[PDB]
Amino acid sequence: KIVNIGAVLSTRKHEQMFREAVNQANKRHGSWKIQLNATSVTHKPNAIQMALSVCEDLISSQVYAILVSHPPTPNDHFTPTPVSYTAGFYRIPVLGLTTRMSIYSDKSIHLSFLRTVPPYSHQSSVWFEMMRVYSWNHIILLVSDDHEGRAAQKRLETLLEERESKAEKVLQFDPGTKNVTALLMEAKELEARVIILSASEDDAATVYRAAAMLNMTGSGYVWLVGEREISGNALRYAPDGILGLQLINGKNESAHISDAVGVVAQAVHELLEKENITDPPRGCVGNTNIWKTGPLFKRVLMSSKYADGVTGRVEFNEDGDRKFANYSIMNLQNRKLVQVGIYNGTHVIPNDRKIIWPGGETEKPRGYQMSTRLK
Amino acid sequence: CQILKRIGHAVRVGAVHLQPRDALLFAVDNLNRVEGLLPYNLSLEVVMAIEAGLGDLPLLPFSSPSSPWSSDPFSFLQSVCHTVVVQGVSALLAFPQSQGEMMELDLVSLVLHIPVISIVRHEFPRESQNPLHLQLSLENSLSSDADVTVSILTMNNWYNFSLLLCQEDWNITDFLLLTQNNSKFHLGSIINITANLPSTQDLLSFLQIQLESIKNSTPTVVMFGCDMESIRRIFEITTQFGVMPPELRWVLGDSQNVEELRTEGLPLGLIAHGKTTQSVFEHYVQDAMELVARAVATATMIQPELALIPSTMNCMEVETTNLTSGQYLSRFLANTTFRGLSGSIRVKGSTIVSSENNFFIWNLQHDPMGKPMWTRLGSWQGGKIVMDY
Amino acid sequence: TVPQCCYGFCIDLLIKLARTMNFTYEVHLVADGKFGTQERVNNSNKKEWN
């Protein structure tokens, strides 16, 4: 009953870390019917050449599950797409260690996938929670023409449907636009001041620059942003005191690797305890049908509930994402991010650190500036 | 101005037949005749990526035995990319029929970094979900026809009905699953009208017994896997003992063409379902061409240089651009939904070009002269049944 | 469409509301002028005010 662990990670250092974690998990496993084998595969520098090498190596070894890592590109849906594609039709679940994106959650594309990182759009709901306490009766939503952005907008609207709020207006930004101030023409139209938006750093840079043009950089306006625009090319045009976002274990690949190793160690013992144990198929051409152990194996895997790994609080559910996530908020002043807020997913722990509203305003104003004339 | 002049003021599409020319010409003519599909006075052009080399089109047809396909898909991919670059094809049309040919076409598309749309008669299980590859299932899942059958019960709350399967191998699993999805539906006693009976009297007795059992339980019936002649024989058997509508309400749970839905032998009040149009290959080709042209025109309305001019300027050079032209064409195709003659072509999962064929539901009612005829009770499309009358 | 002289009883009431509550204003008459009524829609069920 040799269980092989095949994975794809960038650089040989991550492969060495994975091998060390596999060895440590084997040393920490009391099961006498489990043999730990780890196979390391590097990233092929070609989308065409990646699929053939992946099929010729991981599939032939009859390994269990596929672990994803940070793509070599700064932000691209290329590295894990072939993994979720070639093995997706073979009834082989895959866990994304660095999967903070919500794109692969439609359950029709890459159905067999578990998200080891929270979706970026999920924290949008925290915005409602962020709006739950600090007044903010009404805000204006701005979203780019993105599938993830559309899903986040829908989720936020559903959350607002609980409190019966119309969210003032929602603008649908167009990705790749070079003239965004025109869309922000209605920015001064409404009487509110709380702006909820977050997008790519390249997209956010032009808007952040153009806000000062429309005098939106002045005090009395409120802008809330996500971590995607927290740092990057937009950091030049970011407003002072702007409430950004950050996430715990944002670059701790070792913590995610250790947590995944522990979860897999538990899942192997859980699965190797009942009948109908469909062994992994061997080869990439011989296998022309999925394995017998399909949804039952996924359900069995989706049963680990403990505090394992550096991250801890493994509560994967729903489409395959954990629960009780921790978010960070760093105050922007003098082009430097200074942490001022921490959330455990249930209640955000504030800090005594100064929280200046946009324009360097220590006071927090309200989002309703009554009009001086009507029609 | 400059972009159209560089691209010839036209949208070029490559067509490769893995294993049809007249159909492609008809699709191109239909796309050209649909003015306004592509703005900026852009017309649709089709370039054939045949296995032959460079040369002007000859008006001399010669039939020769083609050599066996090369074991290396890399050469085929390079030749396809070179032909597309010579013809400036923004999108690729394919007709894959086997797993290896589909893999080779997908590899060619990935190397060229451009979308490739392939029409497959059978919707094979697809592992790769690359936007560079899109598949159009010519024969979609029959469950849609099953979705039609329960749709009939949705019109007048026919939640109680009997099942008559004239085929022992008929697959009524999809319709049963659709009906069981709603708790209101109450399927009646299972009636299996087998044709293995060797005598007319025994078959008549069995049919009469089945009708007697069904009448006191459900007020309507649904027939699946029954031919027109079988339906006529069943109706004659029912009318022999006087079992007729509307006390015994008949409905056809199978797709039956209007031409084969002869008024003779059909008791009045019977409900039938059929295809709006005979789904020939030409209709599918025209719909795919229209969807691709709409995708190209929509992508050109914002990025004409990207949509018209392909990203791959060299077959051996894979451009690491931020946004590839073929990627834009693939996104437009994945977001493209159109209403072709054969039905509605929608892109689901960025990979499946599903053609939900429009259907017609009719009831057995008298025509203006009083003779029986198939009067369409409504048209069903996208799961919605709208009554014509 | 031309600028017009408007005044009235209710215009005086409007002036009073302006004075007490500190808001400016710009006024214009209506399109077809029938105090508003509940009218059935051209292409929906009933929901239209004219």
Task: Using alpha carbons, list the distances in angstroms from residue B13 to A94, A252, A302, B93, B232.
Answer: 37, 47, 46, 7, 49
Chain B residue whose CA is closest to A105: B349
CA distance A73 to chain B (A): 11
C-alpha to C-alpha distance for A320 and A96, rounded to whole angstroms: 10
Whether B125 and A47 lie within 8 Å, measured CB to CB: no
Sequence-separated (6 or more) residues with CB below 8 Å from residue B136: B117, B118, B119, B120, B284, B288, B345, B353, B354, B355
DSSP B65: P
Report chain A residues whose CB lies below 8 A from the CB of B125: 89
The alpha-carbon gap from A369 to the nearest alpha carbon of chain C, in Å, equals 13
β-strand partners of B122: B139
Neighbours of C42 (CB within 10 A): 6
- The candidate with the shortest Cα–Cα distance to A279, out of A48, A79, A63, A105, is A63
Between chains, do B350 and A109 touch, taking CB under 8 Å as contact? yes
Question: What is the C-alpha separation between C31 and B93, in angstroms, rounded?
Answer: 55
Could you tell me if C23 lies within 8 Å of chain A, comparing CB atoms? yes
Dist. CA A343–CA A324, nearest whole Å = 9
> What would the 3-class secondary structure string for chain A be?
CEEEEEEECCHHHHHHHHHHHHHHHHHCCCCCCCEEEEEEECCCCCHHHHHHHHHHHHHCCCEEEEEECCCCCCCCCCCHHHHHHHCHHHCCCEEECCCCCCCCCCCCCCCCEEECCCCCCHHHHHHHHHHHHCCCCCCEEEEECCHHHHHHHHHHHHHHHHHCCCCCCEEEECCCCCCCCCHHHHHCCCCCCEEEECCCHHHHHHHHHHHHHCCCCCCCCEEECCHHHCCCHHHHCCCCCCECCEECCCCCHHHHHHHHHHHHHHHHHHHCCCCCCCCCCCCCCCCCCCCCCCHHHHHHHCCCCECCCCCCCECCECCCECCCCCEEEEEEECCEEEEEEEECCCCEECCCCCCCECCCECCCCCCCCCCCEEC
Contacts of A372 in chain C (CB under 8 A): 23-24
**C24, A372: Cβ pair inside 8 Å?**
yes
Chain A from 333 to 372: CB within 8 A of any C CB: 371-372
Do the strands B133-139 and B343-348 form a parallel or antiparallel pair, or are they unpaired?
A: unpaired
Neighbours of chain C (3+ CB pairs under 8 A): A
Beta carbons of A372 and C23 less than 8 Å apart = yes
Residue B121 Cα to chain centre, angstroms: 9
Residue C24 in contact with partner chain A when CB distance is under 8 A: yes
DSSP-assigned letters across all residues of C9-50 = HHHHHHHHHHHHHT-EE-----SS-SS--B---SSSSS--B-
The partner residue sitting opposite B127, judged by closest CB among A46, A89, A176, is: A89
- Under DSSP, is residue B95 helix (H, G, I), strand (E, B) or coil? coil
Tell me which chain C residues have a C-beta less than 8 angstroms from the C-beta of A371. 23
- B36 backbone φψ class: left, alpha, beta (φ>0; ψ -120 to 50): left
Instruction: Give the Cα separation of A265 and A274 in Å (integer).
Output: 16
The rounded distance, in Å, linking the Cα atoms of B206 and B193 is 8
Structure obtained using: cryo-EM
Secondary structure of residue B157 in the 3-state scheme: coil
Residue A237: burial class (beta carbons within 10 Å; 0-12, 13-18, 19+): middle
Q: Which residue has the tokens 């509550």?
A: C21
**A374 inside 8 A of chain C by CB:** yes
10 Å Cβ neighbour count for B161?
A: 25
Cβ of A374 within 8 Å of Cβ of C28? The answer is: no
* Distance separating alpha carbons of residues B129 and B126, to the nearest angstrom: 7
End-to-end CA gap in chain A = 78
Residues of chain C with C-beta less than 8 angstroms from the C-beta of A375 = 26-28
* Nearest-neighbour CA in chain A from B356: distance (Å): 18
**Does the distance separating the beta carbons of C26 and A373 come in below 8 Å?**
yes
Chains A, C: CB contacts within 8 A come to: 12
Resolution (A): 4.2
Q: Give the contacts of B369 (CB within 8 A, at least 6 positions apart).
A: none
A233 near A201, Cβ under 8 Å?
yes
Chains within contact range of chain A (3+ C-beta pairs < 8 Å):
B, C
Minimum CA–CA partner of A371 in chain C: C23
